[PDB]
Amino acid sequence: PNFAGTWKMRSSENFDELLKALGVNAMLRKVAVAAASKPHVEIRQDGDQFYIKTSTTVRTTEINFKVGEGFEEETVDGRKCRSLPTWENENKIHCTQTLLEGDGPKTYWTRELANDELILTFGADDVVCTRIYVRE
Ligand SMILES: CC1(C)CCC(C)(C)c2cc(NC(=O)c3ccc(C(=O)O)cc3)ccc21
């Protein structure tokens, strides 16, 4: 499956509840939720090699990884973590995160390519956030 290209968000669900579950300050969530509404996503892929740039006005993250090989990135709430990308299935990547410093909610994300739509999922313990993207 090809995740490469530029994507824009079609819908988000529970992004605020996610930030709640991760203990983010109501005023920060206000800013985050706002910025997260109009995110721009760039994905360059080469087999298991992935480049994903996510941009908003107040924060842009650039992650690079090889499915099957751990890498370092940040959690949704900015905490630096250790990540473990894996092919859950042919078109879905599952990624487990373990915080480098401190302790917190068990988090992970999963990116799935389904019907030319990119389904992004953020988990913070029991809370699940679903963000659907379409090819811009
Ligand atoms: C105000 C500030 C600095 C506070 C710290 C946290 C709470 C860490 C934070 C998080 C975001 N996150 C996003 O903007 C975002 C956009 C798109 C996606 C996605 O769909 O991939 C995910 C997250 C934006 C701003 C901030």
mmCIF file with all atom_site columns, C-alpha atoms and ligand atoms in Angstrom:
data_model
loop_
_atom_site.group_PDB
_atom_site.id
_atom_site.type_symbol
_atom_site.label_atom_id
_atom_site.label_alt_id
_atom_site.label_comp_id
_atom_site.label_asym_id
_atom_site.label_entity_id
_atom_site.label_seq_id
_atom_site.pdbx_PDB_ins_code
_atom_site.Cartn_x
_atom_site.Cartn_y
_atom_site.Cartn_z
_atom_site.occupancy
_atom_site.B_iso_or_equiv
_atom_site.pdbx_formal_charge
_atom_site.auth_seq_id
_atom_site.auth_comp_id
_atom_site.auth_asym_id
_atom_site.auth_atom_id
_atom_site.pdbx_PDB_model_num
ATOM   1   C CA  . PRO A 1 1   ? 0.000   0.000  0.000  1.00 0.00 ? 1   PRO A CA  1
ATOM   2   C CA  . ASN A 1 2   ? 1.072   3.562  -0.775 1.00 0.00 ? 2   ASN A CA  1
ATOM   3   C CA  . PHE A 1 3   ? 0.703   6.063  2.086  1.00 0.00 ? 3   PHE A CA  1
ATOM   4   C CA  . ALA A 1 4   ? 2.813   8.620  0.233  1.00 0.00 ? 4   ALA A CA  1
ATOM   5   C CA  . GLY A 1 5   ? 1.390   11.951 -0.797 1.00 0.00 ? 5   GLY A CA  1
ATOM   6   C CA  . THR A 1 6   ? -0.181  14.992 0.788  1.00 0.00 ? 6   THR A CA  1
ATOM   7   C CA  . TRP A 1 7   ? -3.287  14.613 2.992  1.00 0.00 ? 7   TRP A CA  1
ATOM   8   C CA  . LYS A 1 8   ? -5.856  16.884 4.622  1.00 0.00 ? 8   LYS A CA  1
ATOM   9   C CA  . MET A 1 9   ? -8.245  16.056 7.438  1.00 0.00 ? 9   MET A CA  1
ATOM   10  C CA  . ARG A 1 10  ? -11.790 14.969 6.728  1.00 0.00 ? 10  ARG A CA  1
ATOM   11  C CA  . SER A 1 11  ? -12.740 14.355 10.334 1.00 0.00 ? 11  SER A CA  1
ATOM   12  C CA  . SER A 1 12  ? -11.438 14.068 13.859 1.00 0.00 ? 12  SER A CA  1
ATOM   13  C CA  . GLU A 1 13  ? -13.120 12.343 16.783 1.00 0.00 ? 13  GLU A CA  1
ATOM   14  C CA  . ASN A 1 14  ? -12.178 12.644 20.476 1.00 0.00 ? 14  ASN A CA  1
ATOM   15  C CA  . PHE A 1 15  ? -9.001  14.604 19.957 1.00 0.00 ? 15  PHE A CA  1
ATOM   16  C CA  . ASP A 1 16  ? -9.901  16.702 22.989 1.00 0.00 ? 16  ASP A CA  1
ATOM   17  C CA  . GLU A 1 17  ? -10.793 13.672 25.126 1.00 0.00 ? 17  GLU A CA  1
ATOM   18  C CA  . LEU A 1 18  ? -7.429  12.231 24.108 1.00 0.00 ? 18  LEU A CA  1
ATOM   19  C CA  . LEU A 1 19  ? -5.631  15.330 25.338 1.00 0.00 ? 19  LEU A CA  1
ATOM   20  C CA  . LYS A 1 20  ? -7.721  15.105 28.537 1.00 0.00 ? 20  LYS A CA  1
ATOM   21  C CA  . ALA A 1 21  ? -6.642  11.529 29.118 1.00 0.00 ? 21  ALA A CA  1
ATOM   22  C CA  . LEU A 1 22  ? -3.019  12.631 28.699 1.00 0.00 ? 22  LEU A CA  1
ATOM   23  C CA  . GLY A 1 23  ? -3.474  15.418 31.247 1.00 0.00 ? 23  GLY A CA  1
ATOM   24  C CA  . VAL A 1 24  ? -3.020  18.481 29.038 1.00 0.00 ? 24  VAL A CA  1
ATOM   25  C CA  . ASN A 1 25  ? -3.938  21.903 30.428 1.00 0.00 ? 25  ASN A CA  1
ATOM   26  C CA  . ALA A 1 26  ? -7.379  23.063 29.300 1.00 0.00 ? 26  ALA A CA  1
ATOM   27  C CA  . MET A 1 27  ? -5.772  26.193 27.833 1.00 0.00 ? 27  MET A CA  1
ATOM   28  C CA  . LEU A 1 28  ? -3.226  24.150 25.913 1.00 0.00 ? 28  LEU A CA  1
ATOM   29  C CA  . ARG A 1 29  ? -5.963  21.833 24.624 1.00 0.00 ? 29  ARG A CA  1
ATOM   30  C CA  . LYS A 1 30  ? -7.838  24.931 23.456 1.00 0.00 ? 30  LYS A CA  1
ATOM   31  C CA  . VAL A 1 31  ? -4.754  25.839 21.380 1.00 0.00 ? 31  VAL A CA  1
ATOM   32  C CA  . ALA A 1 32  ? -4.017  22.267 20.267 1.00 0.00 ? 32  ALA A CA  1
ATOM   33  C CA  . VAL A 1 33  ? -7.575  21.393 19.271 1.00 0.00 ? 33  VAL A CA  1
ATOM   34  C CA  . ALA A 1 34  ? -7.645  24.629 17.316 1.00 0.00 ? 34  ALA A CA  1
ATOM   35  C CA  . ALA A 1 35  ? -4.397  23.969 15.475 1.00 0.00 ? 35  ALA A CA  1
ATOM   36  C CA  . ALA A 1 36  ? -5.221  20.298 14.942 1.00 0.00 ? 36  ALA A CA  1
ATOM   37  C CA  . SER A 1 37  ? -8.371  21.235 12.987 1.00 0.00 ? 37  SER A CA  1
ATOM   38  C CA  . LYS A 1 38  ? -6.432  22.321 9.883  1.00 0.00 ? 38  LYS A CA  1
ATOM   39  C CA  . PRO A 1 39  ? -3.405  19.989 9.798  1.00 0.00 ? 39  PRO A CA  1
ATOM   40  C CA  . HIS A 1 40  ? -1.350  19.429 6.644  1.00 0.00 ? 40  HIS A CA  1
ATOM   41  C CA  . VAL A 1 41  ? 0.198   15.985 6.233  1.00 0.00 ? 41  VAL A CA  1
ATOM   42  C CA  . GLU A 1 42  ? 3.082   14.995 3.989  1.00 0.00 ? 42  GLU A CA  1
ATOM   43  C CA  . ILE A 1 43  ? 4.071   11.349 3.621  1.00 0.00 ? 43  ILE A CA  1
ATOM   44  C CA  . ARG A 1 44  ? 7.016   10.023 1.619  1.00 0.00 ? 44  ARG A CA  1
ATOM   45  C CA  . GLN A 1 45  ? 7.334   6.251  1.500  1.00 0.00 ? 45  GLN A CA  1
ATOM   46  C CA  . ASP A 1 46  ? 9.809   3.707  0.153  1.00 0.00 ? 46  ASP A CA  1
ATOM   47  C CA  . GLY A 1 47  ? 8.737   0.224  1.167  1.00 0.00 ? 47  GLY A CA  1
ATOM   48  C CA  . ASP A 1 48  ? 8.980   0.032  4.960  1.00 0.00 ? 48  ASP A CA  1
ATOM   49  C CA  . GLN A 1 49  ? 10.799  3.372  4.959  1.00 0.00 ? 49  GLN A CA  1
ATOM   50  C CA  . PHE A 1 50  ? 8.500   6.235  6.065  1.00 0.00 ? 50  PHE A CA  1
ATOM   51  C CA  . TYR A 1 51  ? 8.683   10.013 6.311  1.00 0.00 ? 51  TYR A CA  1
ATOM   52  C CA  . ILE A 1 52  ? 5.712   11.799 7.856  1.00 0.00 ? 52  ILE A CA  1
ATOM   53  C CA  . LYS A 1 53  ? 5.471   15.553 8.325  1.00 0.00 ? 53  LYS A CA  1
ATOM   54  C CA  . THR A 1 54  ? 2.480   16.906 10.185 1.00 0.00 ? 54  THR A CA  1
ATOM   55  C CA  . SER A 1 55  ? 2.031   20.658 10.154 1.00 0.00 ? 55  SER A CA  1
ATOM   56  C CA  . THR A 1 56  ? -0.215  23.116 11.942 1.00 0.00 ? 56  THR A CA  1
ATOM   57  C CA  . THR A 1 57  ? 0.362   26.773 12.734 1.00 0.00 ? 57  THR A CA  1
ATOM   58  C CA  . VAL A 1 58  ? 1.682   26.269 16.271 1.00 0.00 ? 58  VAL A CA  1
ATOM   59  C CA  . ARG A 1 59  ? 3.555   22.954 15.939 1.00 0.00 ? 59  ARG A CA  1
ATOM   60  C CA  . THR A 1 60  ? 5.076   20.744 13.239 1.00 0.00 ? 60  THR A CA  1
ATOM   61  C CA  . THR A 1 61  ? 6.427   17.241 13.789 1.00 0.00 ? 61  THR A CA  1
ATOM   62  C CA  . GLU A 1 62  ? 8.678   15.293 11.419 1.00 0.00 ? 62  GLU A CA  1
ATOM   63  C CA  . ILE A 1 63  ? 9.094   11.599 12.059 1.00 0.00 ? 63  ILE A CA  1
ATOM   64  C CA  . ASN A 1 64  ? 11.157  9.108  10.132 1.00 0.00 ? 64  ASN A CA  1
ATOM   65  C CA  . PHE A 1 65  ? 11.127  5.343  10.630 1.00 0.00 ? 65  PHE A CA  1
ATOM   66  C CA  . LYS A 1 66  ? 11.454  1.874  9.155  1.00 0.00 ? 66  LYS A CA  1
ATOM   67  C CA  . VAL A 1 67  ? 8.625   -0.538 9.984  1.00 0.00 ? 67  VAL A CA  1
ATOM   68  C CA  . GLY A 1 68  ? 10.137  -3.221 12.163 1.00 0.00 ? 68  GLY A CA  1
ATOM   69  C CA  . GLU A 1 69  ? 12.720  -0.855 13.662 1.00 0.00 ? 69  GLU A CA  1
ATOM   70  C CA  . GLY A 1 70  ? 12.208  1.263  16.747 1.00 0.00 ? 70  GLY A CA  1
ATOM   71  C CA  . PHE A 1 71  ? 12.697  5.040  16.588 1.00 0.00 ? 71  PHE A CA  1
ATOM   72  C CA  . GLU A 1 72  ? 12.300  8.135  18.749 1.00 0.00 ? 72  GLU A CA  1
ATOM   73  C CA  . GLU A 1 73  ? 9.425   10.563 18.359 1.00 0.00 ? 73  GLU A CA  1
ATOM   74  C CA  . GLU A 1 74  ? 7.066   12.457 20.650 1.00 0.00 ? 74  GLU A CA  1
ATOM   75  C CA  . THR A 1 75  ? 3.719   11.485 22.092 1.00 0.00 ? 75  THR A CA  1
ATOM   76  C CA  . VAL A 1 76  ? 0.612   13.512 21.223 1.00 0.00 ? 76  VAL A CA  1
ATOM   77  C CA  . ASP A 1 77  ? 1.184   15.645 24.326 1.00 0.00 ? 77  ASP A CA  1
ATOM   78  C CA  . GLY A 1 78  ? 4.833   16.369 23.533 1.00 0.00 ? 78  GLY A CA  1
ATOM   79  C CA  . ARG A 1 79  ? 6.467   13.799 25.847 1.00 0.00 ? 79  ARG A CA  1
ATOM   80  C CA  . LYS A 1 80  ? 9.536   12.239 24.197 1.00 0.00 ? 80  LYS A CA  1
ATOM   81  C CA  . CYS A 1 81  ? 9.111   8.485  23.638 1.00 0.00 ? 81  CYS A CA  1
ATOM   82  C CA  . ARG A 1 82  ? 10.446  5.246  22.194 1.00 0.00 ? 82  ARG A CA  1
ATOM   83  C CA  . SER A 1 83  ? 8.355   3.951  19.279 1.00 0.00 ? 83  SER A CA  1
ATOM   84  C CA  . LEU A 1 84  ? 7.872   0.453  17.787 1.00 0.00 ? 84  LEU A CA  1
ATOM   85  C CA  . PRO A 1 85  ? 6.227   0.451  14.312 1.00 0.00 ? 85  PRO A CA  1
ATOM   86  C CA  . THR A 1 86  ? 4.795   -2.864 13.059 1.00 0.00 ? 86  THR A CA  1
ATOM   87  C CA  . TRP A 1 87  ? 2.598   -4.054 10.203 1.00 0.00 ? 87  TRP A CA  1
ATOM   88  C CA  . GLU A 1 88  ? -0.580  -5.054 12.034 1.00 0.00 ? 88  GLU A CA  1
ATOM   89  C CA  . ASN A 1 89  ? -1.798  -6.185 8.605  1.00 0.00 ? 89  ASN A CA  1
ATOM   90  C CA  . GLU A 1 90  ? -0.966  -5.461 4.962  1.00 0.00 ? 90  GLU A CA  1
ATOM   91  C CA  . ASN A 1 91  ? -2.330  -1.875 4.970  1.00 0.00 ? 91  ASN A CA  1
ATOM   92  C CA  . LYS A 1 92  ? -2.027  -0.982 8.652  1.00 0.00 ? 92  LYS A CA  1
ATOM   93  C CA  . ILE A 1 93  ? 0.885   0.143  10.783 1.00 0.00 ? 93  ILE A CA  1
ATOM   94  C CA  . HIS A 1 94  ? 0.641   -0.260 14.547 1.00 0.00 ? 94  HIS A CA  1
ATOM   95  C CA  . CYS A 1 95  ? 2.986   1.726  16.737 1.00 0.00 ? 95  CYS A CA  1
ATOM   96  C CA  . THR A 1 96  ? 3.632   1.179  20.445 1.00 0.00 ? 96  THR A CA  1
ATOM   97  C CA  . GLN A 1 97  ? 5.168   3.949  22.524 1.00 0.00 ? 97  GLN A CA  1
ATOM   98  C CA  . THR A 1 98  ? 7.055   3.728  25.810 1.00 0.00 ? 98  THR A CA  1
ATOM   99  C CA  . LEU A 1 99  ? 7.936   7.047  27.471 1.00 0.00 ? 99  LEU A CA  1
ATOM   100 C CA  . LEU A 1 100 ? 11.681  7.690  27.751 1.00 0.00 ? 100 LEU A CA  1
ATOM   101 C CA  . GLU A 1 101 ? 11.444  9.700  30.956 1.00 0.00 ? 101 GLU A CA  1
ATOM   102 C CA  . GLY A 1 102 ? 8.697   9.530  33.532 1.00 0.00 ? 102 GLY A CA  1
ATOM   103 C CA  . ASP A 1 103 ? 5.518   7.483  33.434 1.00 0.00 ? 103 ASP A CA  1
ATOM   104 C CA  . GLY A 1 104 ? 2.049   8.027  32.035 1.00 0.00 ? 104 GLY A CA  1
ATOM   105 C CA  . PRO A 1 105 ? -0.893  6.556  30.088 1.00 0.00 ? 105 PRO A CA  1
ATOM   106 C CA  . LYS A 1 106 ? -0.110  3.671  27.737 1.00 0.00 ? 106 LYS A CA  1
ATOM   107 C CA  . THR A 1 107 ? -0.123  5.297  24.300 1.00 0.00 ? 107 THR A CA  1
ATOM   108 C CA  . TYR A 1 108 ? 0.144   4.120  20.708 1.00 0.00 ? 108 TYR A CA  1
ATOM   109 C CA  . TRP A 1 109 ? -0.982  5.220  17.273 1.00 0.00 ? 109 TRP A CA  1
ATOM   110 C CA  . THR A 1 110 ? -1.964  3.312  14.162 1.00 0.00 ? 110 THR A CA  1
ATOM   111 C CA  . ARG A 1 111 ? -2.069  4.497  10.594 1.00 0.00 ? 111 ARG A CA  1
ATOM   112 C CA  . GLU A 1 112 ? -4.265  2.569  8.193  1.00 0.00 ? 112 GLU A CA  1
ATOM   113 C CA  . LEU A 1 113 ? -4.801  2.943  4.473  1.00 0.00 ? 113 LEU A CA  1
ATOM   114 C CA  . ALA A 1 114 ? -8.392  2.089  3.594  1.00 0.00 ? 114 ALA A CA  1
ATOM   115 C CA  . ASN A 1 115 ? -10.188 2.972  0.370  1.00 0.00 ? 115 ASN A CA  1
ATOM   116 C CA  . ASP A 1 116 ? -7.733  5.743  -0.466 1.00 0.00 ? 116 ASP A CA  1
ATOM   117 C CA  . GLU A 1 117 ? -8.484  7.231  2.966  1.00 0.00 ? 117 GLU A CA  1
ATOM   118 C CA  . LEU A 1 118 ? -5.870  7.448  5.698  1.00 0.00 ? 118 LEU A CA  1
ATOM   119 C CA  . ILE A 1 119 ? -7.331  6.447  9.092  1.00 0.00 ? 119 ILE A CA  1
ATOM   120 C CA  . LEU A 1 120 ? -5.139  7.699  11.981 1.00 0.00 ? 120 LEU A CA  1
ATOM   121 C CA  . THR A 1 121 ? -5.747  6.414  15.502 1.00 0.00 ? 121 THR A CA  1
ATOM   122 C CA  . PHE A 1 122 ? -4.387  7.690  18.799 1.00 0.00 ? 122 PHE A CA  1
ATOM   123 C CA  . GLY A 1 123 ? -4.836  5.619  21.919 1.00 0.00 ? 123 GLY A CA  1
ATOM   124 C CA  . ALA A 1 124 ? -4.291  6.856  25.471 1.00 0.00 ? 124 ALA A CA  1
ATOM   125 C CA  . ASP A 1 125 ? -5.314  3.920  27.652 1.00 0.00 ? 125 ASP A CA  1
ATOM   126 C CA  . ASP A 1 126 ? -9.078  3.473  27.229 1.00 0.00 ? 126 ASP A CA  1
ATOM   127 C CA  . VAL A 1 127 ? -9.480  6.624  25.123 1.00 0.00 ? 127 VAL A CA  1
ATOM   128 C CA  . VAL A 1 128 ? -9.376  6.316  21.325 1.00 0.00 ? 128 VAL A CA  1
ATOM   129 C CA  . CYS A 1 129 ? -9.070  9.223  18.898 1.00 0.00 ? 129 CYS A CA  1
ATOM   130 C CA  . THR A 1 130 ? -9.876  8.654  15.219 1.00 0.00 ? 130 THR A CA  1
ATOM   131 C CA  . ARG A 1 131 ? -8.740  11.041 12.473 1.00 0.00 ? 131 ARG A CA  1
ATOM   132 C CA  . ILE A 1 132 ? -9.676  10.383 8.821  1.00 0.00 ? 132 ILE A CA  1
ATOM   133 C CA  . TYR A 1 133 ? -7.543  11.875 6.031  1.00 0.00 ? 133 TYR A CA  1
ATOM   134 C CA  . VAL A 1 134 ? -8.103  12.146 2.299  1.00 0.00 ? 134 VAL A CA  1
ATOM   135 C CA  . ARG A 1 135 ? -5.595  12.742 -0.493 1.00 0.00 ? 135 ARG A CA  1
ATOM   136 C CA  . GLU A 1 136 ? -5.392  16.457 -1.098 1.00 0.00 ? 136 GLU A CA  1
HETATM 137 C C1  . LIG B 2 .   ? 0.010   24.156 21.945 1.00 0.00 ? 1   LIG B C1  1
HETATM 138 C C2  . LIG B 2 .   ? 0.907   22.915 22.051 1.00 0.00 ? 1   LIG B C2  1
HETATM 139 C C3  . LIG B 2 .   ? 2.346   23.360 21.761 1.00 0.00 ? 1   LIG B C3  1
HETATM 140 C C4  . LIG B 2 .   ? 0.861   22.374 23.489 1.00 0.00 ? 1   LIG B C4  1
HETATM 141 C C5  . LIG B 2 .   ? 1.559   20.983 23.597 1.00 0.00 ? 1   LIG B C5  1
HETATM 142 C C6  . LIG B 2 .   ? 0.787   19.896 22.823 1.00 0.00 ? 1   LIG B C6  1
HETATM 143 C C7  . LIG B 2 .   ? -0.460  19.536 23.640 1.00 0.00 ? 1   LIG B C7  1
HETATM 144 C C8  . LIG B 2 .   ? 1.636   18.630 22.718 1.00 0.00 ? 1   LIG B C8  1
HETATM 145 C C9  . LIG B 2 .   ? 0.389   20.380 21.383 1.00 0.00 ? 1   LIG B C9  1
HETATM 146 C C10 . LIG B 2 .   ? -0.040  19.433 20.408 1.00 0.00 ? 1   LIG B C10 1
HETATM 147 C C11 . LIG B 2 .   ? -0.392  19.838 19.100 1.00 0.00 ? 1   LIG B C11 1
HETATM 148 N N1  . LIG B 2 .   ? -0.774  18.820 18.161 1.00 0.00 ? 1   LIG B N1  1
HETATM 149 C C12 . LIG B 2 .   ? -1.177  19.020 16.872 1.00 0.00 ? 1   LIG B C12 1
HETATM 150 O O1  . LIG B 2 .   ? -1.265  20.162 16.392 1.00 0.00 ? 1   LIG B O1  1
HETATM 151 C C13 . LIG B 2 .   ? -1.503  17.849 16.003 1.00 0.00 ? 1   LIG B C13 1
HETATM 152 C C14 . LIG B 2 .   ? -1.855  18.059 14.636 1.00 0.00 ? 1   LIG B C14 1
HETATM 153 C C15 . LIG B 2 .   ? -2.125  16.964 13.800 1.00 0.00 ? 1   LIG B C15 1
HETATM 154 C C16 . LIG B 2 .   ? -2.040  15.648 14.310 1.00 0.00 ? 1   LIG B C16 1
HETATM 155 C C17 . LIG B 2 .   ? -2.294  14.525 13.439 1.00 0.00 ? 1   LIG B C17 1
HETATM 156 O O2  . LIG B 2 .   ? -3.388  14.433 12.866 1.00 0.00 ? 1   LIG B O2  1
HETATM 157 O O3  . LIG B 2 .   ? -1.339  13.797 13.060 1.00 0.00 ? 1   LIG B O3  1
HETATM 158 C C18 . LIG B 2 .   ? -1.695  15.433 15.670 1.00 0.00 ? 1   LIG B C18 1
HETATM 159 C C19 . LIG B 2 .   ? -1.428  16.530 16.516 1.00 0.00 ? 1   LIG B C19 1
HETATM 160 C C20 . LIG B 2 .   ? -0.342  21.224 18.758 1.00 0.00 ? 1   LIG B C20 1
HETATM 161 C C21 . LIG B 2 .   ? 0.075   22.187 19.687 1.00 0.00 ? 1   LIG B C21 1
HETATM 162 C C22 . LIG B 2 .   ? 0.467   21.824 20.998 1.00 0.00 ? 1   LIG B C22 1
#
